[PDB]
Design a protein around this nucleic acid. Structure first.
Length: 344
RNA sequence: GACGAGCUGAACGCGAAUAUCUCUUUCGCCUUUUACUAAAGAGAUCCGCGAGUUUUGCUCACGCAGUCGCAUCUUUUUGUGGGGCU
């Protein structure tokens, strides 16, 4: 219609925020010797893996936070981690240009996916095919046969580092976000972008799918946008700006969107209304700089009740819902609908 | 109530012969990398191999044919007969 017309529609009909209980940080785990950069939860929900700048992958007990195992095989930072839901496999990528399949029955690297020309930044397992997708500084999403280690496909078109990656079973089966400020939705059968989304002004460092809805969120240093699938229809911006580079985004089944800032902020938003009900800043562990405070990864556990964050003060932090909270004792940041008339 | 030697196909399967490679680690050579050592594992490959009908190539061969739609003395096929009562 217009920006004015749509702004009046928006003042009338914006979905109100669903009340979400606040989250509190209940656990710091020290022990990585570099920035914790990636997290991944195992589908059983009993351990998580964190990769680091100290080049290791640590396996942690999800309920005690206990170091179960350290895995060394990367030469540089571990930048991405993906635990398979269908295979007893963990996948890691790293700044060493290397993608590794870890056999979790051996605790050993059994396959290596060779071919990234620069450091690898993002990883994604196809949820239904035995295929993995990695993006890196060579601006390219490399699509790998899990079994034969073969590079089945190269998704070309981005211009800078592919920083975020999504994989789903419906079309578009790969979503990438890049430092070139675009999101490509890919047709995995054709090897071609099915859509290029140019609404972001900064680089898209975080993508997240909605667990249940056909929609994803992308996050920049400037906005978190929400997009409808298959075609990547812009739904909306979050109703506030985390004034931070967002490194990580996780979405819950309750629709809690967690976004984690390069400055160590953690904002919790209502998916579906776009409204942030919580805003936190990290505390950095003793010794750290407060410059060294970013929030590089976050995942929810499989139930959605825990959020594990991988931080630049080299900690894993764990957050649980203060779910003994009720919309009366704990509403959080309160909502004013987007009443403005603005230009879009 | 009944008949193969040799080749390529079979699609399924590893008597006693065993070499190479890859990966993840440790160990030893030790300036580095190859090229190596010897331990732990996890994976491949090579060179070969057995049976089923597929026949190609016999240079062998066939049909009143080997087989068809237990044979009289006490224990078995040489029965103990005949009558008649409720």
């Amino acid at each position: 219609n217009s920006s004015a017309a749509v702004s009046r529609r928006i003042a009338s009909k914006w979905p109100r925020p669903v009340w979400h209980a606040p989250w509190k940080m209940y656990r710091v785990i020290s022990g990585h010797l570099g920035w914790v950069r990636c997290v991944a939860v195992d589908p059983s929900n009993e351990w998580f893996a964190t990769g680091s700048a100290d080049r290791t992958i640590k396996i942690w007990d999800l309920a005690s936070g206990q170091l179960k195992l350290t895995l060394t095989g990367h030469i540089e930072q571990v930048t991405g981690l993906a635990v398979s839901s269908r295979h007893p496999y963990m996948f890691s990528c790293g700044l060493d240009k290397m993608v590794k399949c870890w056999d979790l029955e051996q605790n050993k690297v059994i396959r290596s996916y060779h071919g990234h020309l620069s450091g690898v930044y993002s990883i994604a397992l196809h949820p239904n095919l035995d295929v993995l997708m990695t993006g890196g500084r060579d601006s390219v999403v490399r699509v790998w046969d899990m079994r034969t280690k073969v590079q089945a496909m190269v998704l070309s078109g981005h211009d800078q580092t592919v920083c975020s990656l999504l994989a789903q079973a419906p079309d578009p089966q790969v979503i990438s976000g890049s430092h070139d400020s675009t999101i490509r939705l890919w047709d995995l059968r054709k090897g071609k972008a099915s859509a290029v989304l140019t609404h972001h002004k900064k680089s898209i460092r975080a993508l997240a799918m909605h667990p249940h809805e056909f929609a994803f969120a992308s996050a920049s240093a400037e906005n978190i946008k929400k997009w409808a699938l298959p075609d990547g229809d812009f739904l909306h911006n979050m109703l506030s700006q985390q004034r931070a580079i967002i490194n990580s985004m996780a979405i819950n089944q309750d629709g809690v969107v967690a976004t984690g800032g390069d400055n160590g902020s953690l904002w919790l938003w209502d998916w579906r209304s776009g409204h942030c009900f919580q805003q936190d800043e990290t505390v950095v562990q003793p010794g750290s700089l407060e410059s060294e405070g970013a929030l590089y990864d976050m995942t929810f556990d499989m139930t959605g009740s825990r959020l594990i964050t991988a931080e630049g003060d080299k900690t894993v932090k764990m957050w649980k819902e203060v779910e003994d909270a009720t919309p009366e004792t704990h509403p959080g940041l309160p909502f004013r609908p987007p009443k403005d008339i603005k230009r879009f």
